[PDB]
Structures are given as structure tokens and as C-alpha cells.
Amino acid sequence: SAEHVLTMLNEHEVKFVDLRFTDTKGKEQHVTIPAHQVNAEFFEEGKMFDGSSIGGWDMVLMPDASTAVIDPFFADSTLIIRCDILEPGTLQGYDRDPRSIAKRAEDYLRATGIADTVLFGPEPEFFLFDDIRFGASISGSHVAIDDIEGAWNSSTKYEGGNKGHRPGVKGGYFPVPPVDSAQDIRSEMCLVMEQMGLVVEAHHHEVATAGQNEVATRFNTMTKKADEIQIYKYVVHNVAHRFGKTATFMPKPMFGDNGSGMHCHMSLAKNGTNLFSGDKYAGLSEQALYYIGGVIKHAKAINALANPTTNSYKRLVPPVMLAYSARNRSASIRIPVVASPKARRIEVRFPDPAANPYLCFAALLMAGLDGIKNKIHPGEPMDIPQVAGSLEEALNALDLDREFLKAGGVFTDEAIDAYIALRREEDDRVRMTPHPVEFELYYSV
Amino acid sequence: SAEHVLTMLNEHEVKFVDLRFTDTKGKEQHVTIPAHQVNAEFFEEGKMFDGSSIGGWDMVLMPDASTAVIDPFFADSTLIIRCDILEPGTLQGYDRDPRSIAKRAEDYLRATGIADTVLFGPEPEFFLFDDIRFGASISGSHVAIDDIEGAWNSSTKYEGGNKGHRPGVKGGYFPVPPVDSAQDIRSEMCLVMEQMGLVVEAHHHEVATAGQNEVATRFNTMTKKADEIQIYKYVVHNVAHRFGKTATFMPKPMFGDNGSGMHCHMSLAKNGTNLFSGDKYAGLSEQALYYIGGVIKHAKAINALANPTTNSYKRLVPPVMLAYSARNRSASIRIPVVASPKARRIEVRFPDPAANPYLCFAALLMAGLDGIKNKIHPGEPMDIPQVAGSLEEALNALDLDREFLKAGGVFTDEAIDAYIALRREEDDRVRMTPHPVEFELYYSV
Amino acid sequence: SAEHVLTMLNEHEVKFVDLRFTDTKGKEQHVTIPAHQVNAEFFEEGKMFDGSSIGGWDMVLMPDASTAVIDPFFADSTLIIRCDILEPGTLQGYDRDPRSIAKRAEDYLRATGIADTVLFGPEPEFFLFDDIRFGASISGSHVAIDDIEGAWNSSTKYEGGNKGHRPGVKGGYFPVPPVDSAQDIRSEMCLVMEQMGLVVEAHHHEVATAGQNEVATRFNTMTKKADEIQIYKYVVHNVAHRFGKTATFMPKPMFGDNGSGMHCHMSLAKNGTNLFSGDKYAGLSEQALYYIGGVIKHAKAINALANPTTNSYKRLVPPVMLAYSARNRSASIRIPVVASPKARRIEVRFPDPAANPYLCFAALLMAGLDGIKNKIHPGEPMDIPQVAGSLEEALNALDLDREFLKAGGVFTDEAIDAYIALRREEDDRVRMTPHPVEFELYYSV
Ligand SMILES: Nc1ncnc2c1ncn2[C@@H]1O[C@H](COP(=O)(O)O)[C@@H](O)[C@H]1O
Ligand SMILES: Nc1ncnc2c1ncn2[C@@H]1O[C@H](COP(=O)(O)O)[C@@H](O)[C@H]1O
Ligand SMILES: Nc1ncnc2c1ncn2[C@@H]1O[C@H](COP(=O)(O)O)[C@@H](O)[C@H]1O
Ligand SMILES: [Mn+2]
Ligand SMILES: [Mn+2]
Ligand SMILES: [Mn+2]
Ligand SMILES: [Mn+2]
Ligand SMILES: [Mn+2]
Ligand SMILES: [Mn+2]
């Protein structure tokens, strides 16, 4: 409540308030107010800003006082307050603001009476590098990745000495220190995440050499979880920074080793009971099977939002199979063997950390409901259709399979069209710029 | 009062008093007295100095005791006292001293009875660079800008490692840390500004890569606000310095990305009521519309004072349109959608931080009154005349449209003529020195 | 004749023929044919090329066999043949081709019967540097000039030793070797110019330090002289190159020392007699005085063609005075004291080597005839109006004073409009790019 935020201000000698919001691409934006400007009027009528220079968008920032967190990093005491972008005066909420769209998808779920709550559990992976250099110019282009754990540094001269304990290319999965360099950086990221209201469940090194890591975090309702992904990413980017590292959530930074994916575990619930539990395949309900059928039916349009970068598809090369299974981890829909009771859920393995968590989760939900809503029966478990093979494909597919997103006003046509416009500009730059292996392939033509 | 300054001296064990004033170009000058020379006589009869070596000008410094502030940066305890330049013995105030001219414009407003107070709200932007090198010699010339946030450093080797989170060229607008490097430098600038009597409203990163920033500050009456711009700039220049950065208020340091403008929000008030509020376009009064008409009528002469550098016009290339609107941000006169009550105001978007805040605000006011005074009706909102396309143009225009500035003794002819003389010397050096892209264009002629 | 070219081919074992032409900007273009493709058909029906990628323009290259010269530089025996750009099939000559325009101006002179021939004598100056570096990028810009004769190298360490005989800044005018480093380079340029059909009269070092030089060359009829300027420039650029130098015809490469101008001496003649000789001022005819009056009347439109670069105006800063005189070398129209008989002529001092010699000479002629044609009496000799103060000014002026160029079809409106379009793009790049002395002037604003 406003009341609560107003006490924290004194209770923490808060000097500043950081208004934050996410844009269409998924990047958290922010603007800072002195604490002495937070008073009744503020939580009532918001703060005006020029929405114009935000990519793909005067507007009003409406503080959601439920979201107040103290920032673990800024030097002066700052309270972060997440905001919604509202349409000014009229005060309804920009139909292009991803948080609004997530909230609308939750209310539409309620209005359909299929369940009261959607539960999401994203498993975001990241890379923790020491040095990243890249550039493109008329005369050429390059990218140079470096990290102390990079199997390639086995030959490197270091002046402290080389010490040689390092994860090999698919060998980052699980060896103790000193091979895993990041125990203290991951534990610290866990401690600061919980200080910002997240619940850590586990943290470990991932498969890739050169710093792949994962902090596993307890689930939430869709828009609350989407905001927890924006905090998750902020803490990873800044703790890494305090440690002299640089973190990145891009899907595929290195060829020849693991990519960073963000698997979404999903579940539906009506009056305190898990609709996805039942009889049917592996403890699932018929309700759950139609959810899978909706996801598989709309998978390529979902890819435009869940895999929104050209780089995303360097990861999705032959979890490409649109199939469910408790057995096949090749199938992009895994039914986790919970064994345990009614923590029954589906897991979609294909999305990645580059995805806008609001639009990605809204689109998984809307697809899943359209399955239920039309008895779109999934089929049989692989123990055969695939995800979009490229961003251009995914964008065409969202453009044509537009209907299930527009249900109940969740996503307007302008919203979908402006999104595709942004993602196309990006796809073009990558399409028209000559790639380094093309010189390898074709210079002596 | 003198009395008050005299207590602060003991109340702060003040070792020195810094007499400060602004020159015609707008640079704050200063001379330092030991606190033990501040006594009755001083606030009565001022301190004599050689005004002769000030660009464009024995004279007397008259301490304005209302302005006393403790300096947040000097090592020994110092009290800053702003001064007016008076004509000696006769004690009237140099008609070339920009502070005097601002004060005269305020009194003339009162004498016309159109209102009692003018309210100004400048939005100054700045750049925060790490390294700036430049030079001109017979054999050549150069400028080299560098900052850690410069999109161009994506390829750079750094020895700590490169870390790569950096604002792209028009992407400085709003991303959270680590992409925005300046959160702690801007918050600190806010805290020291308030310690010097300013009221911060917001601070944020601006659009440009390579360190564009903005600290938004609460309005004031014209001459008080002009002095707050001189403090604003001092704190930005010195906090940046403490942080190992270098700040600059020049309008256009980089081609191909955002320029730093200083938008002036203006409003008039008679007996506690806002004359700019009313019926008419977007909540405006007819009174306000004539103010806009006066600004547009005199815009090119105003440019000689509000855009006084050759570099200013590298920014003003096709907010060039002399038009008002609540909709068109292309129109140099924006009528802000306040929605709220009688915070109704006009916003002139074209001036820039290089402007002398006293002469710039005095000229906006005098133009705006001449509108009112002659019913110069603005026209219709663009939802078509332009600002001076160059300093030479702007200077010719001030020289010919001289009358509205001379009203009521605000600005003498000697004052206007000496000003144009200074700005011309500058324009010539830039006109006669061969430019680097001319070698690009014409060497192989 | 074709016949003659065909013998030279055998008479010189010519392996290739170089088709050359000049574009709107004034740069000589070329395309190369094997000698075995030169036969009847060629001199009859020309050779087709894609005129489209020539700046400001399928078309036909029509070889003018009167122009055949052997190239003194290419490794394999090559005969240069100058061409005209004709409109294809219809075969009339592009009204945008500068050579055509020059030829039209000569025929129009004949059709007016004012005289049979126009004689031009351009005095082009150049600089001969060792190293020229420059560049502009988002993060900065620069130009670096270097030459062994640069007064600035007096302090330089050279590893052969420094030797110190060098022209001071305005001291390049006339000292013997070793101070003048270029005696052998200029004599060689004279010998190769004559081998290409020019007649040298004198060669000497010019006023500037860092390599200003001049090869003085015997006059000719307008279009033949315009082609001799294209050969003049080719020989200077390539002999300099053989010598390890780099030559440039840009008007003002260095601030603080001499610029390179190209003064045009002009004269008119009817039936073997010089119309400019007579009674009147300094041996001039009344006919000649009206020529001067036409040049002065149209001087700013002539500047758009005779001074076509933004850099041109760094030279033309306060021969700016539009005045004739035998005494005042301050007056842009000098009446040379010939003393001798009927080598009476006028000299226009303001054009520069960057000018397209065809369009520059065509415009001087057309202005001069419009004087005669309308008795535009010049006035009295200075012993007061000036040239355009900038390219933008000059371009506006050509755009408005368009009529005298359109006389008799010499220059169409499309031709004039496309020209101004090219020169504007150039003026903009120079206008919008921040200049290095602006950082000197305005960084600490
Ligand atoms: N009922 C549920 N619905 C949706 N997601 C869930 C549910 N229960 C757990 N999760 C998510 O799935 C994760 C389990 O990872 P794991 O149990 O190791 O496969 C939890 O951390 C939550 O993020
Ligand atoms: N009545 C007023 N007259 C003039 N300037 C004003 C007035 N009210 C506010 N301002 C200025 O305009 C700024 C508002 O910025 P924003 O409200 O974000 O467009 C304030 O910070 C003041 O600088
Ligand atoms: N009758 C003429 N008409 C036009 N140009 C001439 C004429 N006679 C000489 N010239 C040119 O003027 C130059 C004379 O340079 P100077 O005699 O040293 O002033 C010659 O080299 C020709 O380029
Ligand atoms: Mn994982
Ligand atoms: Mn999983
Ligand atoms: Mn701004
Ligand atoms: Mn504004
Ligand atoms: Mn000369
Ligand atoms: Mn001469």
C-alpha cells in the first residue's frame, strides 16, 4: 500500500526512489525521484514521462506500491518501485506496455473461469564472462569472448601462473571448486535475490565451459514471476559486475557448447487445486493435455515472443520437437516426473533468457487456454512438428496466428504489429551484414 | 541579510568568502576574500575589482547577502556570495552585467502590471565523458571524445576486461545499471545541488550513448533560477570531476547522436494566479497565446542569446519549427499537458546549456511581454517559420530586432553591440578554420 | 580526325585507349578499351555506358578525336581520348554534361556576334604535401597535414638529420634551393604537360610554407582550356605521386597561410582583334567594361560554380571586393597592366582550383556577355559589394540569378537544380558535423 511505502521511506532513510518499468524488447528502464517527491498525489496520479523515445511506443508512470524493494547496490538509499505505463488522464494502461498485457492475460484467465491462477516457474540460465569485445564496421566485424574458465585458456600465460583447473567444453556440469570458479558469486546472487524478495531453491554451474551458471528460483503467479525475472536479471548483471565479471542472458554466445535457455514450468489452479493433476498420461488431466495441445498448435507464434532474437535460433537447431513426454528430453514439452502429489505441471523447454518475460508468459498462457477452450488434443508422447527455424519464420507465424493472442483484449493488433516491426529491423541487420564464416567458406570462390 | 551572513561565518568556522559573478558569455567568475574582511563596510560599499580584463566589459562587486551558500567542494571552509557588478561610486549596476539585466527584466514586468512574477524552469542536459582531447594548429586540427559508455568502445581492450554493457547510439534512454553507469554520479549531484539550495525533482540518463545525463530541478523566479543554473552547472562540473569524469554543457559534442538542449518552461503570475491558465488551446489563456506570439515573432533574435555558440546550430538542424502544440514535438513551443490545475505553462524547446541563463531568460521574457503588449496572436497549432539557421543569422537578427530588448532599459545598445562583437569573433574563428570533413569531401579535387 | 587517331595507334603500338570525361563536380572519369576496339563504328556511334552511377546524372560516350594524347604514366601504351556525353540514339549531348555546356557557351557567343572567340587563362595553384591524414567518426574528427617544407618541422627529428632550410609561413615566395624543395618536381610537371599538349610559360613556388606551387600555362579558347585544366590537374596529381608526394587542389588546406586560387584571365576577340582593348580605363574598351559589369552583377551566382566547395569560402574571407582596378589587388577584378599591345584583358581573381573548369568558365562568359548585352556599366575603379560569403549563399544566389545562365540553352533548369542538389548535400555534412575549434571555444561552457 502507499502507507507502507511511506513508512519504508523513514524506516530506511531512503534518499531516492527509482521508478522502474520494462519495454517491448524486455529491458528494464528506470528514472529516479528524490524520496521527498513521494506523497499521496504520486501513488494517486502517477508521474508523467516522455514515452516517445522508448523503443516501439507523453505517458504516465503509475507506481505499484506492492512492488517496493530497497536497491542492494546503489550508493545512496534507494527504494525501487515498479510501475505500469498508463494512457494519460484517461488512465487505462498502454496496450503496448508488457506489464499491462501480462495483467490482462491473468484477468482473462479468471473471466474464462478455467482457473483462478496461473503459476510460472522460469529456469533462466546465464553466462559469466571476464571480457567481451565485439564490433562491426564496413571493413569487418568480430566478437571475442573471454573468461578464466574458458577451456581455451589452458594454453594461456597468466603472470600469476596458469593453475589449469577449468571446465572442459561440455564439462561445466557440476565439478567442485577449484574447477567451478563461481560458488561465491552464485551464493551471493542467491542472498541478494532473496533480499529483493525472491526464493532461491538451488544454484549450480551449468554445462558449458567459460562460465555457464544457474540460480533456480521458486515459482509464482505469472505477472509477479515476470517481475521476479526482471529482478533476477538485475541482480545477476550487477553482482557479476561487483565481482569484476560480466553476465549475459543471450541464448547462444558460443558455437560448440551449451546455450542458455529459460524453461518455463507451468501450472493452472482453480480454488486451491491443481487442474493439471489427474489421471491420463503421467498424472496429467485432460485439461492439461489440451493446454499442451494449445502450446504445440501455436508454438511458432509463441517463438516470436519466447525466442525473440536472431541468436535464439542458433540454440534451437536440430529441444526443437513439438512433442510432450515424461521420457523424451528431445521433446520441447517435458512432463516432469513429480512423483510427489499435485505439484503436477508441464515444462516447456524451448524459450530463452532473451524473451520479454511478460509477453513470453502471456503468450504461453493464451496459447494454453486456446487449447483447453477448443479441446485441441495434443496426441501421443514421443518416448513430427518443430519450433520456428528462424526469427523471420517466428515473426511471420505471430503475424498470421495473431488471433489467440487478441482474445479478451490481451494484445491489440497495434501491439503485435509494432512488436514485429522492432524484431524485423533486428533480423535485417543480422541478414545484411556478412558473417565471418562466409569468408571461410567463400573467399576463394 | 548581512546579519545572517555574519552569523554563518561563525556558525560554520568559515575561513574564506568566495565572491562570484557571471560574465557576458555566461561563465561564472570568482575572487576570494578571507572571512575576516567581511564586515558592515563590505555589504554596504562592495569590493572594487578590475572589470577591464573581463571579456566584453575598475568596477564594484556588490555582495547579495541573500545568496550565501557554503561551497561543498573547496578544502577550507568557504562561503559563496553571489555579486552584482555596479558602476562605481554612483552605484547603479553595469548595463552590461547579465545579472543586472535579469533583475531589470523582472522589475519591468512589474512596472507593466501584466503580472508580478515570471517563473522559469530550465531543463539543462549535460554530457559526462572520461577523456576529451582537441586542438587546432596550422598543420591540422582534431577532437577526440572518450567515455566508457561510448558505443564505440564495444571493441576496445581494457585490461580489467571489457564487460560490454553500454548504451547504444540512441539507446541511453533509460536502461538500468550496469548499462547506465551514472546512477551514483547523478544521485550525488542531486544531493550536492539540494545542499546548495536547489530542489531536485528527478534525475535520469538521457538519449545519447557516451554519457548524456539530466538532473531535473524545481522552478523559480527568473533571476533566482538563472543563479540556480550557475550553481547547477558548478555542481555538475565539480562532482563529475571528483568522480574522474569531465562534464560538458556544449550543445552538440557528437555528430549522429543526441544534443544537449536546455528547454525553458515558462509561466506568468499576477496576485498568486497563473495567467497562462484559461480557456483557449489546451487550457491556455489569450494572454499566454500572445506570449507565444512574441517568442515566435522574435525567435531569431532570441537565438543569439538562447543558442549563442556556432556549435548550437549543429543541434538545431532539420526543434526548429516556430510553432506551438500540445501534440507536435517538432514544434519548438510545446504546451505541456499538465492535466493538473494551473501549473499551466508554455515550454520553449529550442535553447541550449551554452546560453547565458540571465540574458537567455531576460530575452525570452521581453519577447513574451512584447507579444502580450501588442496582441501578437500566435496562430494555429501544428499537430512555417524556423529558428535562426546559424549564429551569424541569429546575431544579424538580434542586431535588427533590437527594440523589444531595449524596452524599459532592460539591455542598452552598448550592451547588445558588445555582445554581438564577442559572438562574432567566435563565429569567425570557426568560419576561417578548415574543417576535417572538408578534407574528406575536397582533398581529391 | 578518326584517321589520325587510327595512325597513332600503329605509330605508337598503343595497347589501350582511355576514354575520359568530366562529371558535374569536375572530376575526370575514365574507362579503358583495348586499342583493337577503335575502328570506324567507334568514332561514328560512340560507346555506351551506365551514366546512372555518375554523381548527379545508359548514355553514350562520343570520342572527340581532336583530343588524342598518349598517357605519360600508364605502364602499357595508352592513347587518351576525351569524350562528350551524348543522349543515346538521338545523339545531342546531355544537358548536364559540363563539356557540352562549355561548347554551347562558345556557340552562343558566336550566335550573338559579340565576338568569334573567348580566351581563357586560368592560373591554378596547388599544394604538394608528403602525408595527409584525416577522418570523421561519431567520437571525433581530425586532419593532419605534413610536408618536409612545413615551417612546423623546424623542431622535428628526422634520422637523416633535420637540415632546416624551409619556407617560413608566408615565405614560400621565391627563395632558391634548398629552401624551395620542388624545382625538379615542377620542371618535370612542365615537361610532361607540354608532352600532353600544354604550353608552359613559367613555374615557381607560391607564398605558402608546406609546398604551395604554380605552373603557369598559355591560354586557350574556353572549352579547349577547360580540357587543359583537366590535363593540368592529372599531370600534377600523377607526377607528384611518382615523386612520393601528394598534390591537392583544395582552396584552403591550412589556416594561417595562403590558399590556392585559380585566377581566370579573360579576353574576347572578333575577326582576329581584341575587343577588350580600347580607350577607357587602362586601355580597356567600353565592351570590356560591360563584361566586368556582368561579372560583378552575377558574382554570387558565379561563386556557386567558381568557388563550389565549403572550403572555398575559408579562402574568400575579408579578393572579396567586387571591384575592378589596375591598382587595387584587393579588387577581385584586376585589369593587368599589359603595357604591351592588345594582349589587353581582364583578370578575375576570386575562383579556385576546386571549380569545374567547364561550368566555371561557361558561367564567367555568360555573365560577361549579359553585361555587354545590357550595357551594365561597371562603375569606377577602387585604387562596395562582395563575393558570396558561403556556399549556401552562393547556391541560393545561383538558384535565383538563374536567367543569365539559361540564355541560348547553355544550362537548363534541371542542370542548375541537380548541381545545387549536389552542392547542398556537401554543405550539410560540413554544417552538421561539430568542428574541432568548437571544443576549443565551447567545451567549458
Ligand atoms: N505447481 C507448479 N506450477 C508451476 N511451476 C511450478 C510448480 N511447482 C514448481 N514449479 C516450478 O518448477 C521448479 C521445479 O524445478 P525442479 O523441481 O528441479 O524440476 C520450481 O522451482 C518452480 O519454479
Ligand atoms: N507554473 C510553472 N511555470 C514555469 N515552469 C514551471 C511551472 N511548473 C513547473 N515548471 C517547471 O517545469 C518542470 C516540469 O517538468 P515536467 O513536469 O516533467 O514536464 C518543473 O520541474 C519546473 O522546472
Ligand atoms: N589575350 C588574352 N586573353 C586571355 N587570357 C590571356 C590573354 N593573354 C594572356 N592570357 C593569359 O594570361 C596569362 C598571363 O600571365 P601574366 O602575363 O604573368 O600576368 C597567360 O599565361 C595566359 O594564361
Ligand atoms: Mn539448466
Ligand atoms: Mn528443466
Ligand atoms: Mn531531456
Ligand atoms: Mn521538455
Ligand atoms: Mn599565384
Ligand atoms: Mn594573377
Task: Give the CATH number for residue A229.
Answer: 3.30.590.10
User: By C-alpha distance, which of B105, B127, B84 is closest to B311?
Assistant: B127
The grid coordinates of residue B139 equal 598543420
User: By C-alpha distance, which of C329, C334, C360 is closest to C347?
Assistant: C334
The dihedrals phi and psi of B79, each to the nearest 5 degrees, come to: -105, 120
**Model resolution, angstroms:** 2.8
CA A102 to chain CA centroid, nearest Å? 13
Nearest-angstrom CA–CA distance, B123 and B353:
9
- The answer, for B158 touching chain A at a CB cutoff of 8 Å, is yes
CB B59 within 8 A of CB B86: yes
Nearest-angstrom CA–CA distance, B27 and B435:
27
CB C346 within 8 A of CB C372: no
CA B375 to chain CA centroid, nearest Å? 29
Q: How would you label C189-208 residue by residue, b for 16+ Cβ within 10 Å and e otherwise?
A: bbebbeebebebeebebbbb
How many domains is chain B partitioned into structurally? 2
Boundary (domain end) residue, out of C67, C82, C97: C97
Nearest 5°: the CA angle A198, A201, A205 is 110
C135 and C197 fall within a common domain:
yes
Helix (H) or strand (E) holding C241: helix C222-242
In a domain, A443, yes or no: no
User: What DSSP character marks residue B176?
Assistant: P
Whose grid coordinates read 539540494? Answer: B194
Distance A206 CA to ligand 4 centre (A): 6
Indicate the burial class of B381 (C-beta count within 10 angstroms; 0-12, 13-18, 19 or more): middle
C112 and C85 fall within a common domain:
no
State the catalytic residue, choosing from A95, A206, A392, A401: A206
Nearest 5°: the CA angle B435, B437, B440 is 130
User: CB neighbours (10 Å) of residue A332?
Assistant: 26
In a domain, C132, yes or no: yes
Nearest-angstrom CA–CA distance, B318 and B330:
9
Indicate the burial class of C178 (C-beta count within 10 angstroms; 0-12, 13-18, 19 or more): exposed
Measured in angstroms, the CA of B14 and the nearest CA of chain C are apart by 29
- Nearest 10 degrees: CA dihedral of C52, C55, C60, C65? -160
A203 and A333 fall within a common domain:
yes
User: CB neighbours (10 Å) of residue A378?
Assistant: 23
Give just the sign of the alpha carbon dihedral B248, B254, B258, B262: positive
Q: How do strand A117-129 and strand A131-137 relate by DSSP bridges?
A: unpaired
Nearest-angstrom CA–CA distance, A96 and A86:
10
- Region class of B127: left (phi > 0), else alpha (psi between -120 and 50), else beta: beta
In a domain, A24, yes or no: yes
CB C165 within 8 A of CB C205: no
B413 and B322 fall within a common domain:
yes
Helices (H), B20-164: 40-45, 98-111
B54 and B187 fall within a common domain:
no
User: What DSSP character marks residue C270?
Assistant: E
Q: How do strand C212-217 and strand C117-129 relate by DSSP bridges?
A: antiparallel
**Alpha-carbon distance values, C228 to B349, C192, C240 (Å):** 54, 13, 18
User: By C-alpha distance, which of A198, A187, A260 is closest to A230?
Assistant: A198
**Alpha-carbon distance values, A199 to A102, A202, A205, A231, C301 (Å):** 21, 9, 18, 12, 76
Give just the sign of the alpha carbon dihedral B239, B229, B58, B43: negative
The ligand 2 atom nearest the CA atom of B343: 1
State whether residue C272 is helix, strand or coil: coil
Nearest-angstrom CA–CA distance, B187 and B169:
24
Boundary (domain end) residue, out of B57, B75, B97: B97
User: CB neighbours (10 Å) of residue C419?
Assistant: 24
Amino acid at B216: A
CB B303 within 8 A of CB B396: no
The ligand 2 atom nearest the CA atom of B216: 21
Beta bridge partners of C29: C21
Q: How do strand B16-22 and strand B78-86 relate by DSSP bridges?
A: parallel
**Alpha-carbon distance values, A158 to A92, A326, B163, C46, C79 (Å):** 58, 47, 19, 69, 63
Beta bridge partners of C30: C20
- Length of chain C equals 445
Nearest-angstrom CA–CA distance, B146 and B153:
9
In a domain, A26, yes or no: yes
CB A264 within 8 A of CB A122: yes
Nearest 5°: the CA angle A59, A62, A68 is 140
Amino acid at C138: I
User: By C-alpha distance, which of B62, B26, B39, B213 is closest to B124?
Assistant: B213
Q: How would you label C330-357 residue by residue, b for 16+ Cβ within 10 Å and e otherwise?
A: ebbbbbeeeeeeebbbbbbbbbbbbbbb
CB C438 within 8 A of CB B430: yes
Nearest-angstrom CA–CA distance, B204 and B179:
13
**Alpha-carbon distance values, C222 to C62, C102, C267, C352, C358 (Å):** 20, 7, 10, 16, 8
A-chain CB neighbours of B339 within 8 Å are 88-89
The grid coordinates of residue B420 equal 554581438
Pocket-testing residue among C204, C225, C265, C277, ligand 3, by greatest number of atoms within 8 A of Cβ: C265
Distance B260 CA to ligand 6 centre (A): 8
Amino acid at A347: E
The grid coordinates of residue B192 equal 550536492
- Radius of gyration of the CA atoms of chain B, in A: 22
B75 and B131 fall within a common domain:
no
Nearest-angstrom CA–CA distance, B60 and B97:
11
DSSP string, A158-221: -SS--------TT--SSPPTTTSTTHHHHHHHHHHHHHTT--EEEEEE-SSTTTEEEEEE--EE
Domain that holds residue B27: 1-97
Amino acid at A159: E
**Alpha-carbon distance values, B37 to B9, B18, B47, B48 (Å):** 11, 11, 10, 13
A438 classed as catalytic: no
In a domain, C231, yes or no: yes
Nearest-angstrom CA–CA distance, B347 and B344:
10
Helices (H), B331-444: 357-373, 391-400, 403-406, 413-432, 436-442
User: By C-alpha distance, which of B270, B265, B285, B297 is closest to B374?
Assistant: B297
**Which residues does A11 contact at the CB level (< 8 Å), separation at least 6?**
none
Whose grid coordinates read 562561503? Answer: B79
Number of H helices, E strands in chain A: 12, 18
- Length of chain A equals 445
B-chain CB neighbours of A47 within 8 Å are 202
**Which residues does A3 contact at the CB level (< 8 Å), separation at least 6?**
none
Nearest-angstrom CA–CA distance, A51 and A21:
11
Pocket of ligand 2 (CB under 6 A): A 48; B 119, 121, 201, 216, 218-219, 265-267, 336, 343, 345
Nearest-angstrom CA–CA distance, C142 and C145:
10
Number of H helices, E strands in chain C: 12, 18
Amino acid at C356: N
User: CB neighbours (10 Å) of residue A257?
Assistant: 20
Q: How do strand A117-129 and strand A69-70 relate by DSSP bridges?
A: unpaired
Beta bridge partners of B81: B19
B50 classed as catalytic: yes
The grid coordinates of residue A260 equal 542458455
Boundary (domain end) residue, out of B63, B97, B131: B97
CB B75 within 8 A of CB B43: no
Nearest-angstrom CA–CA distance, C151 and C168:
5
Number of H helices, E strands in chain B: 12, 18
Measured in angstroms, the CA of B160 and the nearest CA of chain A are apart by 8
Distance B123 CA to ligand 6 centre (A): 7
Nearest-angstrom CA–CA distance, A178 and C72:
72
In a domain, C441, yes or no: no
B155 and A132: CB-CB below 8 Å? no
**Which residues does C71 contact at the CB level (< 8 Å), separation at least 6?**
C18, C78, C79, C80
**Which residues does C202 contact at the CB level (< 8 Å), separation at least 6?**
C215, C216
Helices (H), B375-412: 391-400, 403-406
CATH number of the domain that C11 lies in? 3.10.20.70
- The answer, for B438 touching chain C at a CB cutoff of 8 Å, is yes
A74 and B329: CB-CB below 8 Å? no
User: By C-alpha distance, which of B72, B65, B87, B73 is closest to B19?
Assistant: B65
B280 and B401 fall within a common domain:
yes
User: By C-alpha distance, which of A91, A97, A114, A123 is closest to A26?
Assistant: A97
CB A79 within 8 A of CB A5: yes
The grid coordinates of residue A244 equal 569484476
Whose grid coordinates read 555528430? Answer: B255
Q: How do strand A212-217 and strand A200-205 relate by DSSP bridges?
A: antiparallel
Tell me the HSE value of C357 on the side-chain side, using a 13 A CA sphere: 31
In a domain, C378, yes or no: yes
A66 and A126 fall within a common domain:
no
The grid coordinates of residue A204 equal 549450480
Amino acid at B287: Q
CB A133 within 8 A of CB B146: no
CB B227 within 8 A of CB B198: no
CA A144 to chain CA centroid, nearest Å? 25
Q: How do strand A346-348 and strand C273-274 relate by DSSP bridges?
A: unpaired
Beta strands per DSSP E along C182-233 = 200-205, 212-217, 220-221
State whether residue C313 is helix, strand or coil: helix
Pocket-testing residue among B125, B204, B217, B219, ligand 2, by greatest number of atoms within 8 A of Cβ: B219
CB C149 within 8 A of CB C210: yes
A32 and B176: CB-CB below 8 Å? no
B-chain CB neighbours of C144 within 8 Å are 139-140, 142
> Peptide bond preceding C178: is omega within 30 degrees of 0, i.e. cis?
yes
Helices (H), A243-390: 286-306, 312-315, 357-373
Nearest-angstrom CA–CA distance, B146 and B253:
11
User: What DSSP character marks residue B277?
Assistant: B
State whether residue B328 is helix, strand or coil: coil
- Radius of gyration of the CA atoms of chain A, in A: 22
**Which residues does B197 contact at the CB level (< 8 Å), separation at least 6?**
B69, B228, B231
B116 and B215 fall within a common domain:
yes
Whose grid coordinates read 568557504? Answer: B78
CB B308 within 8 A of CB B390: no
B152 and B269 fall within a common domain:
yes
- Chains in contact with B, where contact means 3 or more Cβ–Cβ distances below 8 Å, are A, C
In a domain, A298, yes or no: yes
Nearest 5°: the CA angle C409, C410, C416 is 100
Nearest 5°: the CA angle C398, C404, C407 is 130
A69 and A145 fall within a common domain:
no
User: CB neighbours (10 Å) of residue A365?
Assistant: 25
Nearest-angstrom CA–CA distance, A369 and A408:
12
Nearest-angstrom CA–CA distance, A188 and A318:
36
Beta bridge partners of A126: A213
**Which residues does A226 contact at the CB level (< 8 Å), separation at least 6?**
A98, A99, A102, A120, A357, A358, A361
**Alpha-carbon distance values, A185 to A218, A248, B177 (Å):** 20, 14, 18
CA C145 to chain CA centroid, nearest Å? 23
Distance B201 CA to ligand 2 centre (A): 10
C297 and C314 fall within a common domain:
yes
List the single best residue of B152, B183, B188 to mutate versus A (max A Cβ within 10 A).
B183
DSSP string, C40-98: HHHHHH-EEE-GGGSTT--EEEEE-GGG-EE-SS-SS-EEEEEEEEE-TTT----TT-H
